[PDB]
Amino acid sequence: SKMSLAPEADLDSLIIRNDSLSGAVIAAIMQEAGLRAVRKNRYVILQSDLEEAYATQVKTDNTVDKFDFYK
């Protein structure tokens, strides 16, 4: 709500992907989407930036990363 976003971008797309996240990882994602918006030179955070920034600073793969055959 503090930041300037396109009304096209939507938070509902994000919430489902990760099943674990904390209030400090979220802080970093918004910085990254808003830092990346400066390279493209966009006033708003477009939904392309929001998605890219989501996939970085998450990970949480160490246990099924390449060992997915335990299900």
Next chain:
Amino acid sequence: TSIMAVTFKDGVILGADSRTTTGAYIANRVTDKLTRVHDKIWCCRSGSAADTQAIADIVQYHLELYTSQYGTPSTETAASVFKELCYENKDNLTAGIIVAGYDDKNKGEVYTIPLGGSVHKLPYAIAGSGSTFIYGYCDKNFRENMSKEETVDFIKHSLSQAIKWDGSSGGVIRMVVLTAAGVERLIFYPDEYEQL
């Protein structure tokens, strides 16, 4: 059954009749005796129907494996696999097989493997039951390096006589023309070849 292969200027031509008897009764008047054991090496089968079909599936399996590892087989090579299944088991199997191939490095070749189990490189072969009745007719008329029109006419006159005198042969004459072109089947109906 009466088979033959005649090498010619471009490659080699195989021809056979389509009769399969069990005594006086004719079981099948339309049966393919020219089998593909690879895409450039065909063979013709005579002798006991079963014995040679067992060899033809096993040779088809040995040459597929040969291709996936070592590269395209030669006609020479394919002839030697038949040699090893015929000679080793010659007390059980009765197998008179002509193997006719087209390389792009040696043109058409014919190897014949009679009931014993030896290879023989010949420039034209005849085998089967009705072969006996044309040994003399072919030896007069075979020149080497004939043109594809002339060679098809030379194979038809041959088996025409093989059909007329033998009781085990008859029906359609199928043909496989096996060249640089690829694989071209001909067929010749009973009305057509009984005038010539």
Next chain:
Amino acid sequence: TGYDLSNSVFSPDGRNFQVEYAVKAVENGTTSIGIKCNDGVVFAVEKLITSKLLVPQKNVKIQVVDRHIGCVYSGLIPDGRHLVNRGREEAASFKKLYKTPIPIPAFADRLGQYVQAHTLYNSVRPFGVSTIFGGVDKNGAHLYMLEPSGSYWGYKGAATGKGRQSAKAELEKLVDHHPEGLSAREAVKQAAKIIYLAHEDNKEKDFELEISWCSLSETNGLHKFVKGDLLQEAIDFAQKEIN
């Protein structure tokens, strides 16, 4: 800790220590080169003369396989002499069944499986030998080198043994000057030049040079030994330049 003791175990990294160790056992052997010429191959091996009792020209470390595949190796001499021996079965057997002399890319494959199998159980030691083997069949010349790991590749020159640094650096200059593909008759004299240069880090115990070649156009694609005059000329050629 306990991951080095045994074969066919992996460390947390992803390595077979026994196989890494075997390359150190290859590293002690004598220098051995292989030059792919235009028309065939030239094998050449430094054979150390240990003492005045060893009989001259009588301990060939070049073993032939069939009539057209030279094998020269460095490492554990008995262990190489077993890997070739198994290789004389694989060739004689192919030749029985398909009645054609076994092609070289296929022979490389048979040996490969056999060495690769000996890195799969606790029960067998990995081979301690690097092989250089090649020859001429109806598709041209090939040259191969077989690591004790079980990998092999094509090559245009190969080396193994203590002199593998200086050799592989010298085979680069030989493919520079002669990008067309040097002549087989000439490459006898060039292989000699690569053994005498790689024998300056080992100039303590003199040696005796062995060369063998297999060329389509010189010997009819049959593997022979160079002997007599052409060999006595090779010694002269390399020796005059490095003076």
Next chain:
Amino acid sequence: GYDRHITIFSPEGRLYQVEYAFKATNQTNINSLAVRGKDCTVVISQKKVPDKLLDPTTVSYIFCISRTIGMVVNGPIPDARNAALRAKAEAAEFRYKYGYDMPCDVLAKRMANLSQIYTQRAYMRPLGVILTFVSVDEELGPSIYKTDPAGYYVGYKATATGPKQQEITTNLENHFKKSKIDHINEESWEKVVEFAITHMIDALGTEFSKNDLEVGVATKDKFFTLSAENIEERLVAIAEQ
């Protein structure tokens, strides 16, 4: 000590030794990408020849199993040849005992089961290759199945493997996110190759000469790898776009 050398469970509940095999895979620095066409499949992989001395032709990662099935391998090359030779034998044997050509799925499922027996016996060591089979099966159309040392395998709309596989995954996903279909659509097989190389230049950042790539294409009833001349034609088509 002797729970982490052989394949028995650890006290925690994990097959350590199997897990160690996957780290053995990314020890060659090959990256690969594989996409389903509309009637064909295309798989490109980098081909790094280290020394000047190696003959560039023999180094290869694309293995012809049958006319129907191609196979691209990620990992150490001794185990490559060991899994490719066993694949060829099963491909032939199938044809012999059932009388048609082995489908892609059935070759994939036979490898996963040999892979399983290797993590259950004690004296066997699991092979450290990841195998990807491309084909144009006749029943199901274009297919890709990727098998691994554990013995797990699954179908794929597209896939990548290697050290920098993560970068290549993001692109392959971004494309199926926008178009909302399972497979790249373009009838011709020539233009699926052009698309393929574009996504590798992005994902790795590397510009590719004609020698750095090795391209394989499965169409109907033949699988080939493209000659060094043909890979140069493709790269002129990227430059002219």
Next chain:
Amino acid sequence: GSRRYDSRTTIFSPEGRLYQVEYALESISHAGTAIGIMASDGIVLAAERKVTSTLLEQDTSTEKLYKLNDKIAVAVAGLTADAEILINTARIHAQNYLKTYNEDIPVEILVRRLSDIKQGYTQHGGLRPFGVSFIYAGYDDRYGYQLYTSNPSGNYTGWKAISVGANTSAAQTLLQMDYKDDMKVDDAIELALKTLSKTTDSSALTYDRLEFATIRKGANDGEVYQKIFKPQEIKDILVKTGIT
């Protein structure tokens, strides 16, 4: 080579004992309790299950009582998995003897045969011993009713009343004060339930957590009928004998 990873499950200890057979005895002391009582005119086999949740359908379930032919039933205490393997080798050897002599197998043969199978694994092979202990209740005309227990050593001996499983010691001392030789099949039932009622971990004793089967000669013409009770006969016999 293989020697490094080798447990050696067949060596002696420094004192002339077999560790690995001792330990098999230990894992049998966690499993459920099983009791057998020998009356003059029958045998009671009564076993307490290790499972008890209500989702589980204990009504058709049999994991304690098995018939080996039509005169010899066994009860199990140990790994239920392991026990099914020895029971098919017994079922087969019981039948071979009927094939070759047209006469039902003596109890002594069928017990002595299973014991030596178990003995077999601690003698050679390097396999881990079996983790099972059987109570055999069987009937033969030579001695009448007979009862036998075997353990993972392979040593078997007959008994008048015995118990394997949890608190083997405690169950044997309760029986020892009460048992008498003039018992009938009615009297024995009442002593079997009561003894399980005093040892069960849970104070309540329910009909659903008990398995129960007898062998009585009250089948006509001098014969023996083995019945493994239905869950509705057990329920009525728990109210009759006054345990609840």
Next chain:
Amino acid sequence: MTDRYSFSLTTFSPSGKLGQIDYALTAVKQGVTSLGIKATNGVVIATEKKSSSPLAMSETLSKVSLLTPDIGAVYSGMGPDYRVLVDKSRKVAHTSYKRIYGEYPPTKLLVSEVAKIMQEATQSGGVRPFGVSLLIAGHDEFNGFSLYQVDPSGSYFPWKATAIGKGSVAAKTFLEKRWNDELELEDAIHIALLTLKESVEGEFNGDTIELAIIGDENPDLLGYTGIPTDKGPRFRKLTSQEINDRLEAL
């Protein structure tokens, strides 16, 4: 070349309990949730799809499988270990019971042949236990429907409804209270989904929840008419459209 492992790698730890069957029962508790409910006219079994990636297809993977036309199975634990055990389940069912008695094995019967396969993965030398637990639902002619669980030990049990996997502790508590004796196969389907919705945090599309009934026989899937003696397969895996119906019925 040789195999020289003939000695058990499963020994008795000095306080009973075979060390290797304890561990394997932990890898069965890491697996994905899976559950089954028995009614008076069918059985339902349901499980959640797990996806390596969004690139990986998931329809190609079978996580519910057929053993015979009347007995289906679903697992929790390791994927590779279940694949080889379903193929050894069909051979031993055909070779020691189909050829010899004609009909397909009863469900009691078939569970015992599969339990001997597990058991002999510790008694024998050189091997370790299968890292899976099976649920086996089926139907025989003389005992109706039944549901079984075969654990990596070998022990089996009849259940009325059970669950296994990581959400096994939560799931069986809910089923304890919800199950009844009168139940339809239609009602049970509603319980099976409702529970498995709590246990899957990921996407709950009807693409990615695989449910299959051992209900009643399908005259249509038989493939041939004109034999009133033969009956269709009782097993039937539901398509994705049909499962999306029962979701909007929540």
Next chain:
Amino acid sequence: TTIVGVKFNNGVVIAADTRSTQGPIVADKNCAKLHRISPKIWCAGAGTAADTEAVTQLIGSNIELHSLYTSREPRVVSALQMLKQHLFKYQGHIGAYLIVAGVDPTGSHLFSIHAHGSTDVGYYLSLGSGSLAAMAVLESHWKQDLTKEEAIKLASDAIQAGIWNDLGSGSNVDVCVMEIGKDAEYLRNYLTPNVREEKQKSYKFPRGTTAVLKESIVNICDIQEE
């Protein structure tokens, strides 16, 4: 015995007689002669009746398993290639003659397989003692391209003619129609030529006609309850 297989456009129809004999004595007036290998692959057997029964069941299991393992419907040529190999391994002891008909994703097929492992294709086939009497009828009216009602008539005529003119055949004609993309139709007892005409009299004896020496009862139930 008489067995015909007649391919037409959209499927194949395979029909047989029903009399099974034990030398000159008819063993069973009506009997099953069409065996099912899988839901789409039917075959019929002449020769020794124990050999065809046992071989179809053995190739049944091996193709049912193969079906579940690959997850494809079975192709006809699988059934042909497993028979060929298994009949050869015995060197022609097993006297099984089969017409293996079936449909699948490739199309319809119709094969014949003899006791030595020899195999053929055809568009009409025949087997058994009265096989020659069926071949005359096929040759007379078979033309390329037939409709389902037409082909079914041609198939039952041929068996119709094998019943009158050969002694080994009698009683009912069973037909079995397999169309591409449809459920196989087994049409049991499709033509009944002649039923057993009545007896002149009945022969119920009055009770007490047999002479009985003793009587007893044999308890078959398990040993009676406690």
